[PDB]
Structures are given as C-alpha cells and as structure tokens.
Amino acid sequence: MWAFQEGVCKGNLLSGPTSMKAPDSAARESIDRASEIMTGKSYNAVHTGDLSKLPNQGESPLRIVDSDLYSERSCCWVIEKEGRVVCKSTTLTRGMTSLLNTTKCSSPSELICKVLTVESLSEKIGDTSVEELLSHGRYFKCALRDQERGKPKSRAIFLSHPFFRLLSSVVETHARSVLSKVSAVYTATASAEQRAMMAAQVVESRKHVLNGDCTKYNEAIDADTLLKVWDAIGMGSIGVMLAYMVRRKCVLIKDTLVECPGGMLMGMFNATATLALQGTTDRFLSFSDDFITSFNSPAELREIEDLLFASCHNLSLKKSYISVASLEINSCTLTRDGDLATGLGCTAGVPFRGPLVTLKQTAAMLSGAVDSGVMPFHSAERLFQIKQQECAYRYNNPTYTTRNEDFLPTCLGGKTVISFQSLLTWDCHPFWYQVHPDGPDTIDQKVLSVLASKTRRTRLEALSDLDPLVPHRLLVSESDVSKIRAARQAHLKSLGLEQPTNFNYAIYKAVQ
Amino acid sequence: SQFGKSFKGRTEVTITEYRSHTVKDVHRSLLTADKSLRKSFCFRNALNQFLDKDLPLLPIRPKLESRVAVKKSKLRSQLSFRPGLTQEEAIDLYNKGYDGDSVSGALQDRVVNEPVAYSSADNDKFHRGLAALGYTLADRAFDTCESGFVRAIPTTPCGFICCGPGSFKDSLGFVIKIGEFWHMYDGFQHFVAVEDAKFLASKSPSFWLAKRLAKRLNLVPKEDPSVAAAECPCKKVWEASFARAPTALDPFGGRAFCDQGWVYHRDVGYATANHISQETLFQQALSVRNLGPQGSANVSGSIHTALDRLRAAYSRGTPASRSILQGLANLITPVGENFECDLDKRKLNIKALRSPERYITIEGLVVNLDDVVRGFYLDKAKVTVLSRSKWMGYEDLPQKPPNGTFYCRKRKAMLLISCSPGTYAKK
Amino acid sequence: MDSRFAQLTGVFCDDFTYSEGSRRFLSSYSTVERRPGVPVEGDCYDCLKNKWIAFELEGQPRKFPKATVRCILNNDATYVCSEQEYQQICKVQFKDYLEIDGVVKVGHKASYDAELRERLLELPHPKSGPKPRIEWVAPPRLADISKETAELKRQYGFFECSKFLACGEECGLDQEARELILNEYARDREFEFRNGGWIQRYTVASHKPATQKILPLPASAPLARELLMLIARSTTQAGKVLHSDNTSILAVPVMRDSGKHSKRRPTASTHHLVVGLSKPGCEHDFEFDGYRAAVHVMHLDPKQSANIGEQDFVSTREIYKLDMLELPPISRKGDLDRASGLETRWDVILLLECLDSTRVSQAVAQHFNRHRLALSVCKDEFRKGYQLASEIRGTIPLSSLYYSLCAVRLRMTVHPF
RNA sequence: AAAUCUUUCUCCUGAUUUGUGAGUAAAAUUUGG
RNA sequence: CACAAAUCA
C-alpha cells in the first residue's frame, strides 16, 4: 500500500523489526568490512582534503561536562584479574565510579588533569597508570540494536570503556564548537526539519540537487583522519591518546577479542567526522553521513564527487540520487520552493501499548501531522475516532476496567468518544487531560514505571531536593550528605511541611 | 556504610556522581505492555484509585477559543521562547519548601522550535496540534491600543508611542542606556541599574522594568543601594515625541525607539508573534539600522563568525547595503555582552573574507550577504531554470514573481525565483 | 567562582568562629558551609563583617561584584588586601606555601605525546583505495522490477497452500469444533500434556534453515485484527486453545526434553509453535469426528510474537487509504489480473507485512520512495537495492519481500510516475 | 518440530520536541472473544 | 540536570 501513495511515504506505519539473534554475526561483519576497507580495496579511508584553515582551540581551558559522563546506559568495564581481560556490561555510572575508585580522583576533571600531567606512562595514578588506562580503554563490547525500520538485519552497537567516553566527550564538544565557528550553515544541533529548510534555502541557486548518503561511514573514518582533524583543532595529548585507543580498539565477540584497527565503530565522533568534510569545503550542507550539496553542470558534480572522496565521505551509490523538483535530508523531503512534500512522509503508526498510552501517542502523532500539511484536520479527527474504536475493541475487557462511568473512554467501560479538536483545545473532562499530548502522564505509564522500578539491595542516603543554586560539581562526603539532609529536614520541620511539595511550572504560571 | 562501598577508596565525590548513583534501576522484561498492565490487575486497581482519589484533585484547565484565519504556507519553524523561573524566584520557591529538583529543572530559559506550515495575517503563534485551525496563543486584548502596541501597523493610532508617533502613556515604560547606567522610567518611579559582574545591581530589583532589563541583558537582579546617576534626562525624553518604526515586538516584548532604548508595556509579558520572518527580516534590519545591538534574532552557530561575515560583506557595497548589513548585525548581537556589533569599528577578518560565499542563518532564514550586497533580496529577484518542460500543478509566472517555483511562457521553462524583492521587500 | 581556589578557601576558614561558637567564614565551595538560598558573590562569606571575600592573582581579575573584597596574592610570598584583618588572616593561615595549580588547557602536550605519536606511527595505516566511477542514469524501469520478481520466483518458487496466511480467513468451524480439532492435532503429534496444557518437546536440531518459498495470497483477510489479537494474547497464555469471535489458535511452548527432570514451566525465552486453522484443501488437512480443517503452524520467539501482536491493522489501513491511488486487482501470486483479480488480496498483503517481523517491506518502501523522488541514480547500483533476499530468511519474510516487489511493479505498471 | 547455534533456565553515540521529579517487596498460564 | 515517549542519523 505504501507503493500506491500519491505523495512521499517512508512506509513507517508498522513497528520496527525485532531480532533475538546474537550480536556476534553483525559485529563480525562490521569488523570484516572495516579491515577490508583498511586494505584499500573497496572504499577509501585515507584523508586528502586541506584542514589547515580550521581554527585552533588548543588555548581553551580543559572543561569537562560531568553530566555527560554519568548515565544508566551500558558500558564496558574491564578488569585484569590474573593477566586475563574480563569485560563486563555495567551502567555508565557504575563504570565511571569504578574507574574513579581505581585511580583516586574526586571527579573526572581531576582524573583527566592528573593524566595529562604525568611524567611517565607507568607513573601510578592510584591502582593504575596511563599505560594501563590506554590498554583498557580500547576494549569494546558488542550488542545488537533492533527496531530500526528498514534494517531487517539488526545493526551492531558497541559499548565503550569509561575512559574512552571521558576522553571523547572533550574532543566532541570542541569539534562541535569548531563546527559552529567554521560551518557555512550550522546544523550540528538543528533538527531534521530545520536542516531540510536550510537546505531548501541553500540550494535555491542551482538547478540540480544531490540527495546523497555516505556508505560504511564508521568503517571509512580511520583513526588517522580523526587525529588529523583533532590536530587541526589543536587537541594535543587528548587527541593523540584517543587516536591511539581507537587504532588499537578490540571488540569482545562471544568469548574472543577481535582487533578492529580500521574505522571508528560507533558514531562517538560524529562531530569530528562531519568536520573532516566541512573543514575542506563549504559546498556541502551536511552532518555525519547526510549531505545535500547542489550543482549546475556535470563538472560541478564531478568536483562534488572528488571532494566527497578526498574527505573519506564515500558516496553511497545505492541510496544517493539526484533530484530537480525536490530535496530530501534526514528523511524530510521539501519542494524547491520550501513547501513540505505532499504525502505521509515519516508519519508512523502507534502499536498497542496501553489503553491510554495508545490514545496519547495517536494524539501526539496526529498533532504533529496536522501541524504540517501531512493531512487535513478532519482526516486526523477520523483517524483518532478509528483509533479510539480499535482501543475499545482491544482494552474493553474486565481485566482492564470494572467501571461504567459515562465520561470514561469506550476502551475503559465508558461511552465517550472524544473529538480530536475537543481534546486538543482542552475541551474535555479532566480525565482526558492525560490523553492530551501535552497533558500529564497516563495511568498506564505510571503503572508500567512502578512495575519496572519494583524489580530487583542497599541504597545510599538520598541527596534530592538540593539548593537550585548549588553547582553539581561540588564535593560531598558521607558526613556532608547527612548534614545536608538533616538541615533540609529541620528547615521543613520549622516550616511545618512534609516532604517537599512538587513544583509544576504550568500551574504556578497559571496562578501567577 | 554504602558510601564506603559504592565510592570505595574516596571520601568526597561530586554531587553529580552521588545523584547519578541514587537513580531508580528500571529493568526491561519480555512481557508486552498489555500483559504487564493485566498482571495482578495492576492497571485495574490504578484506574480505580485514580477515579476514587486522584481524579477529584485535577484542576480544570481553561478551554481555548481564540482563532484566526490561517493559510497554507512553506514549512516554517515556530520559535517559542517560553521562559524559566528567575534566580530570585527560584530562591523564593526553594525557601518555601518546594522540590529542589523540579525548581532547578524549571530554572532554565529555553528556546524551542516547532515545524509548522501555516501562516496567518498577523503571523501569530499557534498551539501544538491546532496550527491548522489557527488557534493562536494570544488571548483577546482588553484595551485596543495594547493590541496596537503588539501589532506592527496599528489600525487606530492614539497619537502616542505605543501605536503611533508620539509620547508615552501611563501604561508604558522605557529602559535606556545613558552613559554607564541603565535608566528605567515608568511614569512614577525612575530607577538606575548597573551591570556588576554577572549581576544587575539596582535599588529595587522587584521593579517590573528592572526585571525586564535583567531578562534582556541575561543578568541576575540584585539589590545595591549605592547606585545613582549624575544626569537624568528621563523626564524630557518621556515628555518628548518619537517615531514608531513598524515592527513586531522583539522576543523580549519591547520595541526600540532610540539608541539602546526599549519601550515596554506593563500588561504584555512576551511577544506572541514571530518577531523575525521572511517578509519582515529586512524591515527589521532597517529599523535597527543605528540603534545599537538589539539581540532579538538568534543566529545559528557562532555570533562572532556571523559578525565577521557581516563585516567582510560590509567592506564593499553601496550605502544601502552597508545599512542593511549594519541592521542585521545589530539584530543578531546581544545587548551588554563583549560583542562589537558596530561594523565600522569591527576589525576586518581576512579568514572570513576569503570565503567565496557568506551565508548567515537568522532565525532559520539563510541569507547570502554576498547577494544582499549586490542588491538581490531588495532590488532584483534571482532566477534559476529548473527544466524546459512544463510541470503539472504549478502556477504561471507573475509579472513581479515572489519566491517560489513558477512556469514561464515567454521563455517556456520552469523557473525557481529566489531572493525575490516581492517577498522580502514587500513595499 | 573557580574550583581552583576551593582547597585554598578551605585553608582560610580554619576553625574561625564568631558569636561564641558560630562559624565565622563560610566557604562557597563547601555544601554544608554554604547558606541555602543565597547567591554566591565571593569565594567565602564573613558573617561578622557580612562581606564576601574572593581570592585573585597578579593581573588575573575574577568576575565578582566590586563589593567583594579581593585578597590579591602577589607573585612574591606576600598577600595584600583592602581589609587589614583579612590580609593578616591570609598571612597567618597560608603559612605553608599553597601554589594554586595552573589551569590546564585542552591542547596540553603531555610528556608522553611524542611516545604515543611514535607508537601510532609504527601501527598499521590504511591504503588509498580506488576512486569510484559513477555514471548517473535514469532510475530502474518496470523491466528491472519484473526481473527482480522473476528471479525471486525462479530461485524459490511458490508453496502449494498459503500456510499460516490462510488463517486470516474463517475456517468454517464453530468454537467447539475448533477446540476439538486443535486439541486432537496436538495429541496426534505426541505433544506432551502437563497441567492441562500442551508442551512441544524436542531433543536434537538439524541446525539448518527451514524450506523457503513464497506463500500464495488468499482471497482476503477478514480476521486480520482477530488473528493479531489472538497472537498478542498468546504471548503469555500458551499451551491452551485461545478463542476469538470467528477463529482460534493454540500456542504450544517448545521446551527441551531432558527425559526425567525436564523443563515444566516456560521461561522468558521459550518459543511458541502457534497453531491455527483454515479451510481444508492442502496437505496439512486434519480430520477428527467428521470435522476437517487445515492446521498451519508457525514458530515464533517471544519478541516476534510481541511485535506481531502489538500491530494495529485497521488504523494502518485507513492511514494508507488517506492518500492512496486506486489499488488494482491482483491474482493469487500478486500479478495484475483485471478479469479475475481480487482487490481484497491487498489487505492480505498488509496482514503479511504485520506477520513479517523482519519488516523487509519497510526497506523496499524506503527504496521505492527514493526511486519515485529520484531523477538520476548511479548505474547498476540503485537497482541493486531491491535485492534484499540475502537480508532475510524464512517463508514469511521471503513472501513479504516478494509481495513488496510485486506492489512496486504494479505501481509502475498501472500508475506510472 | 520451525521464521533452525534459538527454542538453556541486554540495546551504544548524538540531536529536535513533549511530560514527570522521596512513592517503598517474587514468576509466563491465574486474567483479554 | 535524571527518567520516560515520538522522530532523525
């Protein structure tokens, strides 16, 4: 049915594919592709452009954003027990904390300052050394990423050592800064639609448009190219160490370590890879493996191809194409006059995930669609009505509702089929506010969150409800945390108030 | 003694690390959402509790009724400038016992963009999901000349600065930089503030004009009795009459009337209409031609690089082009920061001069300063031939085409008119 | 406010008290000493004089209010401050030379920079590689898609019956007959019976893929929503016959057979053999007590079952119809048949896209969108984007890919672009 | 036996938008027409 | 700032 759409359609209606296959196969294919590229037989991994004009940021103070070094995402923690390397998947927070415990350091900034100011690679920074940190930081753990529409074979993702993440954060932030200072049209932060609008304005002066993509982007970006860019933007020891770890990276597959000297595996250096091209020419409005350059004559197209080749941005012959009446970037297609291309486009369906989550997600999708010219409002109203009927069919059983209140949805025993326009303009019973895209969390989300949290030890003393002015980089000991908690409790008691009352900006502004 | 295990080997850790360690450890199970909600009748009991206890405690939100006529247009970005709690407000809320985390999260002035393809006559801002129906954010105005103030071209001028060339009312104030001080006048109280190392030192920060100036300058209001000014022409300037340039209110909710001088309305908090648009960007630039930095238009990337490109384009060009570039530089440069918006005093940057094309993105609008210099966006349109074959569903080329794709019969080809004067300079 | 001076400030506020016990100097870098709800205007706060104190070096001014007294640390071992008492405290407390660590730049060149650069140089480097020769030609024509479909048919062929796709239509049996047929089919296949439920037992595996062929399209899929709802229900309810308004299925867990101490209860990763009924007339017919029906099985891991169940059929159909062109009739094998084609077969195709957990149809849809938008594409390379047969394995994904290609070809045939 | 290393007892990096922030105990049939 | 949902690479 996606074939017979009059306009543009990505076929996003159904959910992304799922796969329970082990990640060994995809990781092995990626490593083999990188090694083959290193031989210079299929694609190019050697940089040739002139990055001498990039500004030098080497004089900027070394500032680390601590918030980016802690998260619940998985990471590879490496242990050397008896001469053997054991790689385990642990939350990035736990990996960072274990790293800081191994080498005595209050904060990551102190750790990096100590690392940069050692007189030898064997000098101890605690129970470790810079050489050991470099050896351990090159290890990666493979995993499978699925639910990506259009990729029947789930992609391979890689978990990196905390030290690698710590070193890469600095270079990525500075590369983004250099991109802002150098790029003709900044797009490292712009969304897909903003990039599409900027491209539609930029390519207005040329007859042809080249909607292109880069193939084997991670495998074609050698450590040499990254170090070249970093030296262009003046990274010194940090860039050298990061390039050394990248060049010596090992990926743990099943129970064996595989060397992957070529490429950079993950998109940890998307900003640097983009700068590798933006630093050599200003004819491309690109970020990562997505460019929208335009041309007038075949000679300009040949020049564009040469520029792409020289910057290790191998053109994707399978996906890249040339258009004259439209232009597509980041799956957003616009006409040459800027109007959004008619058709469904990136509109996606809402799988059944709850009596009210489904309705809320449908409302959000329909609002996003109607805001643009995807479909007229009455079509969105009809679709919302149909989705409500489907939810009534699916979730109107005794295991989901024992009520008969009239105001309830037909999918929870009621008889109310709310109009989309009525819901959007806050013209519904307060029970329906949660269903609104901008309303509060639905009962289903709260229940699911409670169930997720209710699955499992020993918790640290809480440090919530802090001063909104206290910087988060300040050091707190156990006694300091206890004193802070006692002081806050005493202040609440003196005010005769229980645990701090939650603050909602919307209600406060409304009553202001 | 968990602090001795999670952080073994250390006695002090940052607040970030400690907070990140005490986070709920959610787990992913293969069960579907429906089966999880059915399990132990968890969702059934949750719904019963919500309908018995939580539902009565839900405030009744107001209905939306304001609507305006809208027309399909290009895919634009609605720029919302929703503000956050101010520093003093955050302190007050925290000391009252409110949640620290929620207050801190709300303490952030964020700029958001929403892709919307719908434009009204006054170029307003619409709610999320209701741009098709033209549900504007603005509520119906009580007094007419307030709406005149918020409107670029007032329908009925009351002869005063808010909506016409004239003096000020009792409901209008103005903040103007005199010497090394910022004088705020309202009609009753005249205050003077100074920029003291990231703070805004003033006699009484609670003054509405003082808060507005603090927000405009990105400074924290502070109390400082030892602030005074030598010469105060605020009375004479208040009693005088000024020309009202036709422009929508800046994102801060004020309009420029003189060099480093902005008029504010007590009842109007923030601008509800897109200040910068394709048809008003150049008029806005001309209006602030010689009014110093304004800081009303966010430029993508680095402001220093944008100013360097503007200066490089400023080296050559006719006087009108130089004025337009100076106005754009004033628009993009913030107020009170270490920026040299004045292009005459700006040092020429050869590195930004050698580039073949000078593009700057103002509020998502990509302007080629090289084209502006040679009189393109104001004098003559740019035509590029897309094909020699007529396409279906495209209107004929008018005699004075605006920006867009059209069909031309005299040449028998599809043209894409760009940088048309009929779109930017719509006299 | 710079953390560099934090330690320094700690030395300043060295057990200084005022008002008979209260601490005098409160460090701005200490959380416990910090006064909540007060902005920071200096490195520390003195309650006795109610003054903010900041520390600086020679020619290194700090962003602080003028009211903050600065204890300028001269290059020499001397401390100068506006207030005599603060200068005296600086001279006293700072008895041991506290050299503030200099700010570390991003471009810091460590002592090992040359060694690491040498090590990297001695490591392998890539080779240049070839410059591709790109020829821009018109997008693939109808002949190319026809060749793709013909190649798929030749390589794999077609099945005799629709297999589980046939379950999208009524089997012509009432609830009792369906339950009896399913239970007797399970019993005949020697499925283990435990706790009133069926369990499929396996011992050894051939470790080779199952036969792949294209499923011919049934006439229609009236029970698409019902079948998907049953599949969603069967995620946890396994081993017993699950009924619906017009059809029923049976999800038999597949568990290893140890022989004595064998798995009794399915776990999170136990697979399900979903068994469904359709009209007879294929090799899978099963008869019992005069009730005859074709029994079709499908092996699904938990993720496949969840993904298939969660999909919404009616909403997707309506969204597609919003801006769809007239769908043409198609034959049993997805071929344009104006005389004897059935438009309802398109619904079946949609159902197939729902059953195909690999969703290769999404890849085909993206490539066809590019094809429709494109004006010129790389020669011999853009055409090699529909050849996704190597990305998928199984009867259902193979059929889904084949019918996606058939839909593309039909679009190029009846509604040229 | 099938969508065949599975039926054996975790999913990376970055970005745009939106909503919440001291709310605490096992296991997949119990219970969806 | 942390978590959750949608989309993009």
Ligand SMILES: Nc1nc2c(ncn2[C@@H]2O[C@H](COP(=O)(O)CP(=O)(O)OP(=O)(O)O)[C@@H](O)[C@H]2O)c(=O)[nH]1
């Ligand atoms: N670490 C990740 N990087 C991603 C992810 N998605 C996209 N990317 C980045 O974008 C790059 C392109 O990936 P695509 O999503 O376009 C996958 P595609 O099959 O088109 O890549 P090729 O194998 O190069 O053809 C990829 O190499 C990464 O640098 C993701 O989930 N994780």
Ligand SMILES: [Mg+2]
């Ligand atoms: Mg692209």
Ligand SMILES: [Zn+2]
């Ligand atoms: Zn007026």
Ligand SMILES: [Zn+2]
């Ligand atoms: Zn004055």
Ligand SMILES: [Zn+2]
């Ligand atoms: Zn059969």
